[PDB]
């Protein structure tokens, strides 16, 4: 078997003649998030593109931070709208990125400011 990329992907077993698909196994990279050696030593390690306190993200697999329902401006980016920061004793936390603060203008037919 082959793909458009000219690499073997499908192999038929000669012994009993069924079809087997070959997929590359567990390939990615490691990344470490730190808040600076001048303040603390705790770090959080992120494996990207790998399906695994373990929190699952759309950017991979992140270990060392816990999810929070709260929202903050981004400090240390991760990917796919996820960010981390040291400030909460103090542990690394991952929060969904938030954009600005909600505000609604009072627009009427005959009102000006």
């Amino acid at each position: 078997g082959r793909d458009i990329a000219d690499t073997t992907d499908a192999v038929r077993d000669p012994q009993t003649l069924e079809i087997l698909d070959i997929t590359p196994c567990s390939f990615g990279g490691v990344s470490v998030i730190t808040p600076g050696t001048n303040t603390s030593n705790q770090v959080a390690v992120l494996y990207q593109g790998v399906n695994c306190n373990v929190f699952q993200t759309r950017a991979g697999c992140l270990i060392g931070a816990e999810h929070v329902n709260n929202s903050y401006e981004c400090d240390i980016p991760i990917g796919a709208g996820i960010c981390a920061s040291y400030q909460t004793s103090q542990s690394i936390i991952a929060y969904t990125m938030s954009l600005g603060v909600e505000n609604s203008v009072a627009y009427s037919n005959n009102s000006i400011a």
């Binding site: 458009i4 990207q48 796919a80 600005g100 505000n103 009072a106 009427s108």
Partner: protein, 403 residues
Amino acid sequence: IPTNFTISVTTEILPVSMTKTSVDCTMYICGDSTECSNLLLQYGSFCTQLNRALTGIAVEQDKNTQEVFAQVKQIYKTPPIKDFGGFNFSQILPDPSKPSKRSFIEDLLFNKVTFNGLTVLPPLLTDEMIAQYTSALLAGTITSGWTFGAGAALQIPFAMQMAYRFNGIGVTQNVLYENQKLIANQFNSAIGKIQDSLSSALGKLQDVVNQNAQALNTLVKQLSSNFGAISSVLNDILSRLDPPEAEVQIDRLITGRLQSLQTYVTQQLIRAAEIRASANLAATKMSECVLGQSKRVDFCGKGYHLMSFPQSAPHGVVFLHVTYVPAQEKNFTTAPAICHDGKAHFPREGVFVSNGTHWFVTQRNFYEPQIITTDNTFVSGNCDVVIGIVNNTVYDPLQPELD
């Protein structure tokens, strides 16, 4: 002098980002071979150099999208009332019905556009966040005019904002306040026509995706080349031959693959430079044309500029420039100044015209004939010096009340 006008809307597409990629040099060059990695250790630091270049490209690509859209620091909300003095913004405003907070034009645009050591990193900003930015900018433009571009937003009725906008190009407010329904109908019809036109175009956004795919495919295909060696597969070279002789083949393979990787990274960096330039231009357009009227000719669309509504597209931004264009003109006879009592009377703001039997003064862009008066004109110079002068009487408002 023009006597009628039509409103038209034209699109503009500017790419702002390209796919962020990274490559594991050891996996690409040598695969899972043990001796190949040992032999590859001779060169050194090439992998670090390549990875640094790729990472710099990726962070620049993220920063471009961060810069182009994040202009406001306050998320705005569209008011529930949909009355805008006859203007129909249903097509471009966000639709809560759809599962994703994307408007009709965004949805139509998105549909229209269509593993050996290589990885693709996801963007920092998801599509929902970009759509939220776009909706906030659209609402800020609609409700607050240009005020929210500088400081706290200030609400203002849409009709008055349009009257202000004509006042920028050099036409009085009466031309709007007396022809509001016509303008609303023309704008809605133009929006609908553009919506139909986009249904069947593009080509700038499809370029970057195709180029990236072609480059990656070419690299993967180049994986299998022999590069002057006897066999492409490393496993055959290791098993079949004597270890002393296999080193020459391994060296040929690694040299060729390294050169191909260098070519790929140079091409990517060259293209990223151009993408950065285009993103800078798009950011400038976003800042100037949208957050306020633009006096620059043709910078924000052919014809006089009124406003523009940004829209989101895959790896890019699609604009909607609104322009004013004079429709129909009539021949007229003009004079520089009128001599009344030996003194010239130069017009204050308009240009003097003649029906063929009398004389009138009117604004340049729109034919609005007005009777001559001392209020509309000032006095300077003498009758002799002027190159061309016509004889006519100047009406004075003070004389009638002398009873």
